């Protein structure tokens, strides 16, 4: 589980993302599509090319969800329950895919937060992202 410190470092790192959340999510995704091609299968109806408005769009959707989660860091199960139902029942994304996108969020994040991405914060974000995935995966079966 997270800790009083994980939570603060999380709120800390995210407050620094600020208004970039949208372009970081898009980047996060781009990195995921190029690094782990198999993930593309879920986005057949997307133009996965660089700069694409769709990725830029979804990425913002994804970042907003996270921003929401950061602020409900002490109550995620219910703060993202709708999203946990969406990915489990309608989309049905294989779970192994969440660890792939989490790894890219971290990368995108490390590439934009030079002074804040410290060994402790990096440890905090990883646990945070693992928890988000755990929630979004809880309704799978």
């Amino acid at each position: 589980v997270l800790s009083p410190a994980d939570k603060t470092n999380v709120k800390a790192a995210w407050g620094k993302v600020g208004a970039h959340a949208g372009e970081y999510g898009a980047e996060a995704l781009e990195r995921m599509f190029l690094s782990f091609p198999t993930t593309k299968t879920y986005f057949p109806h997307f133009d996965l090319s660089h700069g694409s408005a769709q990725v830029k769009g979804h990425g913002k959707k994804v970042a907003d969800a996270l921003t929401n989660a950061v602020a409900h860091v002490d109550d995620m199960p219910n703060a993202l329950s709708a999203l946990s139902d969406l990915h489990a029942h309608k989309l049905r994304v294989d779970p192994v895919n969440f660890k792939l996108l989490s790894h890219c969020l971290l990368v995108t994040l490390a590439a934009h937060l030079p002074a804040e991405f410290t060994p402790a914060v990096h440890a905090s974000l990883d646990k945070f992202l693992a928890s988000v995935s755990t929630v979004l995966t809880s309704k799978y079966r």
Binding site: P37, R92, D94, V96, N97, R141
Partner: protein, 146 residues
């Protein structure tokens, strides 16, 4: 894959006693019940609700004999799995958009299913050899993704 000659024999010997019509459909069936999120590539097949709706569905069972069929060609050309499924790889990715990860799940469900089917005959050494086959097979069915 690369199995010692003894592993090769075990897998062939045991595979010869398999009933394509029966095992194939059970494997796929158990994949869907145990790993429901894989049901997305069979929304057309019909009623995939409860276990029986799944196991009973002739479309799922029908498709089962096709995978084991392809699997069979695999053991025939184990010295070259990648070329054998080259075509099936492009189909599952380009036309069908299937996450290679589910091939991994199907591999394990298959092993469980053969163990349930042969019991003690399915010894630890035999399983081990089968794990390699299903692993290689899955790498092959993923080798053309891009």
């Amino acid at each position: 894959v690369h199995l010692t000659p003894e592993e090769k024999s075990a897998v062939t010997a045991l595979w010869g006693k398999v009933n394509v019509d029966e095992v194939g459909g059970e494997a796929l069936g158990r994949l869907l019940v145990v790993y429901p999120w894989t049901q997305r590539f069979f929304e057309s097949f019909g009623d995939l609700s409860t276990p029986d709706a799944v196991m009973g569905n002739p479309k799922v069972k029908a498709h089962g004999k096709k995978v084991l069929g392809a699997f069979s060609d695999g053991l025939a050309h184990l010295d070259n799995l990648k070329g054998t499924f080259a075509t099936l790889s492009e189909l599952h990715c380009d036309k069908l958009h299937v996450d290679p990860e589910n091939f991994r799940l199907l591999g394990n469900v298959l092993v469980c299913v053969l163990a349930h089917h042969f019991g003690k005959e399915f010894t630890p050494p035999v399983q081990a050899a089968y794990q390699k086959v299903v692993a290689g097979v899955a790498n092959a069915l993923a080798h053309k993704y891009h």
